[PDB]
Paper text:
[name]-[name]-2 [name] is a functional homodimer of two symmetrically disposed protomers that are each 306 residues in length (33.8 kDa). The active site of [name] features a Cys145-His41 catalytic dyad, which orchestrates nucleophilic attack at the carbonyl carbon of the invariant P1 glutamine and the formation of an acyl enzyme intermediate central to efficient peptide cleavage. Using C-terminally substituted [name] chimeras, we have determined X-ray crystallographic structures of [name] in complex with 10 of its 11 viral cleavage sites, bound at full occupancy intermolecularly in trans, within the active site of either the native enzyme and/or a catalytic mutant (C145A).
Unlike the C145A mutant, obtaining crystals with the C-terminal P6-P1 substituted sequences bound in the wild-type catalytic Cys145 active site was more difficult, with only two examples observed for the [name] and C13 variants. In the [name] PHTVLQ WT structure, the ~2.3 Å resolution map showed the clear presence of a covalent acyl-enzyme intermediate. Given the nature of the C-terminal product-like complexes here, observation of an intermolecular covalent link between catalytic Cys145 and Gln306 from a different [name] homodimer demonstrates that this reaction has occurred in reverse from product to acyl enzyme states. Remarkably, a non-covalently bound C-terminal product was also observed in the same crystal, but in a distinct active site in a second functional dimer of the 12 molecules of the ASU, providing the direct comparison of a product and acyl enzyme substrate complex both in the native active site context and identical crystallization conditions. In the WT structure, careful analysis of the electron density for the native structure supports both the covalent acyl-enzyme and non-covalent product carboxylate binding of Gln306 in distinct active sites. For the acyl-enzyme intermediate, the thioester bond formed between the Cys145 γ-sulfur atom and the carbonyl carbon of P1(Gln) creates a trigonal planar linkage group (defined by atoms Cα, C, and O of Gln306, and Sγ of Cys145), with Cys145 χ1 angles (defined by atoms N, Cα, Cβ, and Sγ) of ~ −70/−74ο, consistent with our previous observation for the C5 acyl-enzyme intermediate complex24 (−66ο).
Author numbering:
A (entry chain A), B (entry chain B): 1 to 302
């Protein structure tokens, strides 16, 4: 038994992290086959970040301006090409440690694992969730730029995030591996702020189902609320509206526990209005919203 | 910025995970050099689990009774010996993925990364802390036996924990990599109970420091306390006594925050007395004690 926030094993991703340096800037890169993916602002100086024109900046750069190091093996940059907001540096050597991989764009409320890296060396791994406001509440320091977010499904790695910048509120923004930013964010130094974040309601319900599976049942009640009556309460507490698809997705968990989705919603409704009155759920004093219904099934097979 | 429970990169440990089968029992094993380490209860028969004599069970087993599989490759068992509660299987092949490693027995209050495994296949990685009662709060299901806990220092993997069983309360117990159990437990299916779980005080102080680094300062206070006066309050609320060494280890966090360790002690003393008053530190209504001072420094720019 037990339920913990779990990251995917990071071995397949570690073998693709290289150190990319351009000028006086150093960040991380993802080495897949003969291509190294890194954020395109590596070609930016500190003073150019105010209003960088990447088209001319990249064209003024030459191949030898890109110092790619895989550990201490120096990789020769054969070419550089713009990939939206990330760079595609071609190297002469394919990565022997290249795993079965795919580029996937996740939706808000979905989770993934982050392999935090500094100077091309992995430092830690944790689990994140794409917030409704298209940011992530990660742990990124200076030089973490280029750290990648991924999921793993049967030895196939689904890369979904690359870290680019930290927003003023401390949350972090980035792109998918195709170079397209999540949310309205752009890779320049402008007055940028994340929108008002909301709580992933379906994830909380999945987490509550995980608590019931593991024996934590004190929050259950005889009540059953309509989908709309729950949603009105949820809006007042900055919770995402629950959709019918969310109810459908929570179907397997409802069957495994024998508790109807709307019955569990009444439990969450009461929890929102009354609080946890000092009690804990799965060792937590807050309503966790970073476990997808899939994330629960993995840790709670039936 | 940002603070999260961060597990070490699991790549070096993934290469040592193998599947061990004995009779009808299958659990995970640790393949280092030409030796496979796994919990000795793999040789237990179904109805012998209540109170087994492993010396009998080992004499009833030969080398070819152990099925060891590293992925698709079957491993030949040359020898087998019992070291306390750990089964050592000698194989004809040294593991080519064996990293630099050592066997250490961590102290209570220390944290380590757990690589949860099933059928010799890693499935997730998360952070665990050795509770003062020598239990850990993890996510272990059937087949997770042999899942290992480790810390990484530079290129060296310090193996410190192998999972053996789950206590009735749902907490988890295991041994060091030499077969010696953490705490008073024995690998039998009896009614064992862990001791009373006190709170790791030095970890709470580090967590409060990690909060100050990440913005949360509401709990902060001007008055200070001596070590002995704080220890009296800590003893009342089942907190571990705070030694001078704990004060020294917290020094780096004090330097980054500009807050004396004894001043943070007074802020914790106030919190233990008047409680939360409905506020949160780092998104939690309770005090976290599963982050060591080293764990906080890893995520904070000193
Ligand atoms: Na209910």
């Amino acid at each position: 038994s037990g339920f913990r926030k779990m990251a995917f094993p990071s071995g397949k991703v570690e073998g693709c992290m290289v150190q990319v340096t351009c000028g006086t800037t150093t960040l991380n890169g993802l080495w897949l086959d003969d291509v190294v993916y890194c954020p395109r602002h590596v070609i930016c100086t500190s003073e150019d970040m105010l209003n960088p024109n990447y088209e001319d900046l990249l064209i003024r750069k030459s191949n030898h301006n890109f110092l790619v190091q895989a550990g201490n093996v120096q990789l020769r940059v054969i070419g550089h090409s713009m990939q939206n907001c990330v760079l595609k540096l071609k190297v002469d050597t394919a990565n022997p440690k290249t795993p079965k991989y795919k580029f996937v764009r996740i939706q808000p409320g979905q989770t993934f694992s982050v392999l935090a890296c500094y100077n091309g060396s992995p430092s830690g791994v944790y689990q994140c969730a794409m917030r409704p406001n298209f940011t992530i509440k990660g742990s990124f320091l200076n030089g973490s730029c280029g750290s990648v977010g991924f999921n793993i499904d049967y030895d196939c790695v689904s890369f979904c995030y690359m870290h680019h910048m930290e927003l003023p509120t401390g949350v972090h923004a980035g792109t998918d591996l195709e170079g397209n930013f999540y949310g309205p964010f752009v890779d320049r130094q402008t007055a940028q702020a994340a929108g008002t974040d909301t709580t992933i309601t379906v994830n909380v319900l999945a987490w509550l189902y995980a608590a019931v599976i593991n024996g934590d049942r004190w929050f259950l009640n005889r009540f059953t609320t309509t989908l709309n009556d729950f949603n009105l309460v949820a809006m007042k507490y900055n919770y995402e509206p629950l959709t019918q698809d969310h109810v459908d997705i929570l179907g397997p968990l409802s069957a495994q526990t024998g508790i109807a989705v709307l019955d569990m919603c009444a439990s969450l409704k009461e929890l929102l209005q009354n609080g946890m009155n000092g009690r804990t759920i799965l060792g937590s004093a807050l309503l966790e919203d970073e476990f997808t219904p899939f994330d629960v099934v993995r840790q709670c097979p039936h």
